[PDB]
Design an enzyme around this catalytic site. Structure first.
Site, PDB file in Angstrom:
ATOM      1  N   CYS A 135      -7.807  39.587   0.358  1.00 43.27           N
ATOM      2  CA  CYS A 135      -9.131  38.987   0.476  1.00 43.27           C
ATOM      3  C   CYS A 135      -9.775  38.657  -0.866  1.00 43.27           C
ATOM      4  CB  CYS A 135     -10.083  39.899   1.267  1.00 43.27           C
ATOM      5  SG  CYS A 135      -9.404  40.496   2.840  1.00 43.27           S
ATOM      6  N   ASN A 159     -14.785  38.201   8.863  1.00 47.21           N
ATOM      7  CA  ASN A 159     -14.053  38.278   7.605  1.00 47.21           C
ATOM      8  C   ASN A 159     -12.923  37.254   7.631  1.00 47.21           C
ATOM      9  OD1 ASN A 159     -12.521  38.896   5.351  1.00 47.21           O
ATOM     10  ND2 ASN A 159     -12.828  41.107   5.548  1.00 47.21           N
ATOM     11  N   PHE A 183     -11.378  40.200  11.292  1.00 46.93           N
ATOM     12  CA  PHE A 183     -10.827  39.015  10.649  1.00 46.93           C
ATOM     13  C   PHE A 183     -10.980  37.790  11.540  1.00 46.93           C
ATOM     14  CE2 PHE A 183      -8.552  42.439   8.453  1.00 46.93           C
ATOM     15  CZ  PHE A 183      -8.777  42.069   7.142  1.00 46.93           C
ATOM     16  N   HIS A 228     -17.976  39.383  -1.303  1.00 47.63           N
ATOM     17  CA  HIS A 228     -17.006  39.195  -0.234  1.00 47.63           C
ATOM     18  C   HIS A 228     -17.314  40.140   0.920  1.00 47.63           C
ATOM     19  CE1 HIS A 228     -13.241  40.587   1.772  1.00 47.63           C
ATOM     20  NE2 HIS A 228     -13.180  39.292   2.026  1.00 47.63           N
TER      21      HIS A 228
END
Ligand code: CL
Ligand code: CL
Lengths: 383, 387
Positions: free
Chosen positions: B161, B334, B212, B301
């Site tokens: 990531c 995500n 995700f 992030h």
């Protein structure tokens, strides 16, 4: 003040190669004896016609020696490697994730020792490996094994192919030239654990790959503004780094990661496609015989097609064809071996420059795409 | 050669000139995801398992994710609905096609905003965790886009990531070291390679299935922008640093197996990141120090709500600093390396909607954060521009 930082942060000179280190697995397999070893461990000694077909393949590679990690015992203990297409991606990953950074660290230490400066001055790490994808990658493992600073800026190049030798250098050029005092540690490590396959029933591309690819690792220190006052000696200066893909050859050389490992395909138009489209990148980047040459030894057919299209005398490919003979095709690592021999032999023979007496040179990478990496090098004096 | 060096060198800093985003059309809302995720996997009976997965999905604070794996898709490839079954060959067959195509979508958008033809693109950085192939997705996306044959490509596979910041850090050097260079970045994260079936044990996959989402991003990075031809600077990159937290390589795993990507995310990751965030802060700000972290704008992030809260707490950040971050996490989940690009695009657009003095919420200087396996921390100091 960001434009003030921009100048205070950038280097001034071109990226130069400050050191080169190499490594290979200890066990060497002579090409004239590999077919007899290859068909024995797979338990296919009864396939005489297939064995002599693989012999002829190994004879025409012009390879004489290759260093391989996969010994007879390792294959004996992992039978799934000896089954033609049995699931073995996990057992291959198990060896690769450990050995890829290990062989890379081995070559990295040699380069660092020659460079002579403390590890703390290494600011970047470019690790390149075709096999053994893992998270975190081999860039972290190698930095961990080498003991580099936690602040090392890393670049992890996985599953690129044989051209990635020029890619690594092309990336190191910008990192070293754009950052003042940066010292880029490049590490290419290629081990044929992920491409090993058993004798063929319509998969001789593996046989062509079984006879051609060998294991090895390389490492360089690339930095701008070389400092002799401490003892830094620049080997070559990178002047330009280009990359192009051959328009019509997406399937000429392809590689697909499967559950039975990496399945590669190398067609017989690769020599013709490179030779017919190699002159383009050269004219953009002059008498070809007034340069020194570091060509990726993807195979003798590729070397002849390049040697014939540019009208080069045999002298130009001596370093390249020597690496192919003594180690085989080591994927992205090969061009570092060739560069290392050229500069050592020039420094040993007392030539006028590090590039066999010539002042200008060209380095080639060839891989999936088809991709051609073209780097123009500037040889430097021998003291 | 030194004259060739100065003449082929850019002048100013690397600047973001355009941002384009894309997602798979089919949207999946987190409250309805358990009913869907357990129906496609033929687990509608597991009431207690489904409720346990609801709890995880609720704790993510995610409202919807855009997923490529629909009911028809998972029914075309039932080996994906099989827990730990041979499906890499199946996953790759969908990844090598979708990763570039979804990346192409976001690419075209950034090129539309950029305003310049794809003729002036000189570099292409492609990043994607899944779908390793030769030639890579960088080449396939260059071919789908019809880019120059001589584009200098960088293919980042299986990074994680943080790779969003790795892309920009690479783009920073490519654009600043080559005069006239226009770098096209393309991040494309599709959960084909990480999709798994419900397993009451596998807490990491249940987290990963609830965290995700699929998404693609693309930017145009270049130094010395030409305003007269239509190039609008968004953010200037001042410093790009990377760091690995020592003795944390087991915290976030990632093993590509015959059954797809097998990842592990441990619960000390929030704590691990918060304790060492300042170390990456001080290194990236080179010699400059900050007496108040709120004196900057932030692009973090969104690896998860627990990591966001720990970073915000450790640095004592005002809620307004995570707004763009928590918005992307809420609206898309995500998206691995793609997520920070959504946040940057949300920040600059929302700044112009409110009429802020800068593209960074009225603040001149800002920090961009990527988190990934390592533990790796990508830190990028950003400069905002006026009007
Ligand atoms: Cl640096
Ligand atoms: Cl360029």
């Amino acid at each position: 003040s960001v434009d003030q930082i921009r100048k205070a942060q950038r280097a001034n000179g071109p990226a130069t190669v400050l050191a080169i280190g190499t490594a290979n697995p200890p066990t060497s397999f002579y090409q004239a004896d590999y077919p007899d070893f290859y068909f024995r461990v797979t338990k296919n000694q009864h396939m005489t016609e297939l064995k002599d077909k693989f012999k002829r393949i190994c004879e025409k590679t012009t390879i004489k020696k290759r260093h391989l990690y996969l010994t007879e015992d390792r294959l004996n203990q992992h039978p799934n490697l000896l089954e033609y297409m049995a699931p073995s991606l996990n057992t291959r990953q198990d060896m690769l994730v450990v050995e890829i950074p290990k062989l890379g660290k081995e070559a990295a230490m040699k380069a660092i020792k020659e460079w002579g400066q403390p590890k703390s001055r290494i600011t970047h790490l470019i690790f390149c490996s075709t096999n053994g994808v893992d998270m975190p990658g081999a860039d972290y493992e190698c930095a961990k094994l080498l003991g580099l600073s936690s602040s090392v800026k890393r670049v992890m190049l996985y599953q690129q192919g044989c051209h990635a030798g020029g890619s690594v250098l092309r990336i190191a050029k910008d990192l070293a030239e754009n950052n003042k005092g940066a010292r880029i540690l490049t590490v290419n490590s290629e081990i044929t654990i992920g491409i090993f396959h058993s004798p063929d029933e319509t998969y001789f591309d593996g046989m062509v790959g079984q006879a051609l690819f060998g294991d090895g690792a390389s490492a360089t220190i690339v930095g701008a503004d070389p400092d002799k006052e401490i003892g830094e000696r620049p080997i070559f200066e990178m002047v330009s780094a280009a990359q192009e893909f051959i328009p019509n050859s997406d399937g000429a050389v392809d590689g697909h990661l499967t559950e039975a490992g990496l399945v590669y395909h190398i067609h017989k138009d690769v020599p013709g496609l490179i030779s017919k489209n190699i002159e383009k990148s050269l004219v953009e980047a002059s008498d070809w015989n007034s340069l020194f040459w570091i060509v990726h030894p993807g195979g003798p057919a590729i070397l002849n097609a390049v040697e014939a299209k540019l009208h080069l005398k045999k002298e130009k490919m001596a370093d390249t064809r020597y690496v192919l003979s003594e180690y085989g095709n080591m994927s992205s690592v090969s061009i570092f071996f060739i560069m290392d021999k050229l500069r050592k032999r020039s420094l040993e023979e007392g030539k006028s420059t590090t590039g066999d007496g010539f002042e200008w040179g060209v380095l080639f990478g060839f891989g999936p795409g088809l991709t051609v990496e073209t780097i123009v090098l500037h040889a430097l004096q021998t003291s």
